[PDB]
Design a protein around this ligand. Structure first.
Ligand SMILES: *C(=O)c1cc(N)ccc1[C@@H](*)C(=O)OCCc1ccccc1
Ligand SMILES: CCCCCCCCCO[C@@H]1O[C@H](CO)[C@@H](O)[C@H](O)[C@H]1O
Ligand SMILES: [Cl-]
Length: 179
């Protein structure tokens, strides 16, 4: 069974997605988006809660599938705290990069997913004895997912910088952990 962090993130993402359909996207953003006014700067949740908002059925579905699988394996084999820190750092840095080039109106677990991909793969590669690795088939489907994003496939128009930021964090932490 999926652990407490894997579970609560999925719940939170569904609750927020529901809230977005009922109230509208823009209204949910006013509460959860990255600070878009200087007066909102000390509302600390906003540097993270942008990761809980999704705009498309397809990104929430696939973001949560990857989260469920990679997050779940990290949680079970390496503990809940590990998953928390990976999420918080990747959300913060991917958010930071995104807002820098495209402004404060954005959201999604896309960045956090890149970080779990990076983490799980590089950790399996460098430190087999940890128990976690990214299976061959999944490397392939991860790469297709990455490629679909990079080249704007399937009518998608996302920013690459934030995704790079997320992957960098996952690699960095995998590097640190395999010493
Ligand atoms: C982030 O949300 C993101 C990042 C990348 N690189 C690709 C997609 C997404 C969102 C997502 O999962 O969208 C669905 C893509 C998809 C999956 C399967 C078939 C067709 C399209
Ligand atoms: C560009 C010139 C005008 C700027 C207008 C920006 C107003 C700042 C909005 O603040 C936000 O208002 C929301 C509802 O209005 C609340 O949900 C939220 O708690 C609050 O933080
Ligand atoms: Cl989305």
């Amino acid at each position: 069974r999926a652990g407490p962090v894997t579970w609560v993130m999925m719940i939170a993402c569904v609750v927020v997605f529901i809230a977005m359909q009922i109230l509208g996207d823009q209204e949910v953003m006013l509460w959860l988006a990255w600070p878009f006014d200087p007066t909102l700067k000390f509302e600390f949740w906003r540097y993270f809660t942008h990761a809980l908002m999704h705009f498309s059925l397809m990104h929430i579905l696939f973001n949560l599938l990857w989260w469920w699988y990679l997050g779940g394996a990290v949680e079970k084999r390496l503990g809940s705290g590990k998953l928390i820190v990976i999420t918080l750092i990747s959300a913060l840095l991917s958010g930071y990069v995104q807002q820098k080039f495209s402004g404060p109106w954005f959201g999604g677990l896309s960045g956090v997913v890149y970080a779990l991909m990076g983490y799980v793969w590089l950790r399996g590669e460098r430190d087999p004895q940890s128990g976690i690795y990214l299976q061959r088939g999944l490397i392939i489907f991860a790469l297709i997912w990455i490629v679909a994003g990079w080249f704007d496939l399937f009518g998608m128009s996302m920013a690459n910088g934030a995704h790079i930021a997320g992957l960098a964090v996952g690699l960095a932490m995998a590097f640190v952990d395999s010493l």
